[PDB]
């Protein structure tokens, strides 16, 4: 007051963060064949082919791959960690153990690089998983026991946005009933899935509360079919074409509006502040 200045501080944050480079890690959990590789070739508009699984995997394991993407002038390194062999064995009581071990191993990598005397946290590359996409089988009856067990065992370690895979197989009366049943099982079991932000007066009330439609009923594929005058992505059937960019068929738009559009930095900040801080407190209390 007297006159201006000091409005460029957020701009300086933006420039320094952009120069440093962005990093996002996504954990893809779902039974083999549900569309995880397909949905995340859909989500990032590129071909992340990763071999269509041996259904006779002796043990549940994780395939972690790292790629570089660039849009306009922002550069982001994706660590996509697919659960390979999950839900294929006869014995599934140990299905989620490797995934949790992997998450905690990445947390320990970060925390161990932090405590080193000659640390380089400014330049060191974090490997913690920022968002977890869970694939719900389009059963029509609810959520299976394995889905509940995995979500519960993994709710406090990474953000979960429940996603209905191959959602193009349920009718809309059935889809509404099945969605309401999912959220009923979620609240009754008390699963702390990732909820929309509330604080920001801009979007975090209107879009946040309007998107009370979780879980998202989404579909994915790689073929572009001609609808109207656009090569829109779609899943083809003898009786027609299921479009993915139209709201009335699937909820893929809202899922992307979380992951890549509006709440990605909230996901990273919650990973560093809500989950990493919990693990760090627990570990530092354990070690002394």
């Amino acid at each position: 007051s007297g006159h201006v200045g000091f409005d460029s501080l957020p701009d300086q944050l933006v420039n320094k963060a952009t120069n440093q480079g962005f990093c996002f890690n996504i954990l893809c959990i779902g039974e083999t064949g549900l569309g995880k590789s397909t949905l995340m070739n859909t989500l990032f508009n590129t071909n992340f082919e990763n071999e269509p699984q041996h259904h006779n995997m002796p043990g549940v394991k994780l395939k972690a791959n790292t790629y570089e993407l660039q849009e306009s002038n922002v550069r982001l390194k994706l660590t996509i960690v697919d659960s390979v062999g999950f839900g294929d064995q006869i014995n599934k009581e140990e299905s989620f153990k490797p995934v949790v071990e992997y998450i905690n191993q990445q947390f320990e990598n970060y925390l161990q690089e932090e405590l080193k005397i000659c640390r380089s946290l400014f330049s060191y590359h974090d490997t913690r998983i920022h968002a977890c996409l869970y694939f719900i089988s389009p059963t029509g009856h609810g959520l299976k026991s394995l889905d509940l067990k995995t979500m519960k065992n993994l709710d406090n370690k990474v953000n979960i946005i429940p996603v209905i895979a191959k959602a193009d197989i349920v009718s809309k009366g059935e889809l509404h009933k099945f969605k309401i049943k999912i959220m009923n099982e979620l609240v009754t079991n008390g699963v702390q899935i990732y909820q929309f932000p509330t604080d920001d007066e801009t979007v975090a009330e209107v879009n946040a509360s309007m998107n009370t439609h979780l879980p998202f009923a989404v579909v994915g594929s790689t073929e572009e079919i001609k609808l109207g005058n656009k090569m829109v992505k779609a899943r083809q059937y003898p009786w027609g074409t299921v479009q993915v960019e139209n709201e009335n068929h699937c909820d893929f738009v809202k899922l992307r509006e979380m992951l890549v559009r509006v709440n990605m930095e909230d996901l990273r900040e919650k990973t560093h502040t809500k989950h990493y801080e919990l693990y760090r407190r627990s570990k530092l209390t354990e070690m002394g």
């Binding site: 039974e31 269509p52 006869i90 089988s137 059963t139 009856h141 394995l146 067990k149 191959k166 899943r235």
Partner: protein, 219 residues
């Protein structure tokens, strides 16, 4: 008489296709004995989920030794995955010694035509590799040949009533179109229903003469 049991995972809709097949756990509704088997695999561990069906068929033959026999073992293999799970392969390998196995792909309306061709070839490869002796069924010549080629079948079901394109029929309503369960070009519902209708007696006699008779040899 006929004992139609459907076997597989839980939640693939097989109850709906059962109710749609005849336009009208067990049910004796010809005296059609429907056995809507409880969809196994809902539990975390599926080591013992296979057992309940063996003693039921084992006891079934025991009263016969002491026509409730399962003439058709309708097996519904998941549309979601890439092929045969270890659970399905173990169950088919452990069951075909006794009860006449027939494979059918559940929820065919969730699948594309190139993929169903792919999954049929992979299912046949996994049957041949594990020496599974699946039923080869023996105008009658034409339907016999088509059924041999069409193994395994892909079938959709529907219970609710729809005013599609006019006439009131059974089907499914989707924003992309109407799934006509009756229509042969949409799925093999008609192929399955006609095969059972036309080969009911052959199934009874073959069960008595091949599967039941070698069981006497085993017994």
């Amino acid at each position: 008489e006929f004992t139609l049991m459907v076997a597989g995972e839980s939640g693939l809709g097989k109850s709906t296709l059962v109710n749609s097949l005849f336009l009208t756990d067990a049910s004796t509704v010809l005296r059609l004995t429907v056995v809507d088997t409880p969809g196994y695999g809902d539990a975390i561990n599926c080591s013992d989920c296979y057992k309940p069906i063996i003693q039921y068929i084992d006891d079934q033959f025991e009263r016969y030794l002491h026509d409730n026999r399962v003439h058709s073992c309708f097996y519904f293999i998941s549309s979601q995955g890439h092929g045969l799970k270890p659970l399905d392969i173990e169950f088919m390998k452990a069951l075909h010694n006794k009860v006449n196995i027939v494979p059918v792909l559940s929820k065919a309306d969730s699948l594309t035509m190139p993929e169903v061709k792919r999954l049929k070839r992979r299912i046949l490869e996994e049957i041949a590799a594990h020496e599974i002796q699946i039923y080869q069924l023996p105008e009658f010549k034409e339907q016999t040949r088509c059924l041999k080629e069409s193994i395994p079948f892909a079938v959709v079901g529907s219970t609710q009533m729809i005013e599609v394109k006019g006439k009131k029929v059974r089907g499914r309503l989707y924003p992309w179109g109407v799934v006509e369960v009756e229509n042969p070009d949409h799925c093999d519902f008609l192929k399955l229903r006609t095969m059972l209708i036309t080969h009911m007696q052959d199934l009874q006699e073959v069960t008595h003469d091949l599967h039941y008779e070698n069981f006497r040899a085993r017994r």
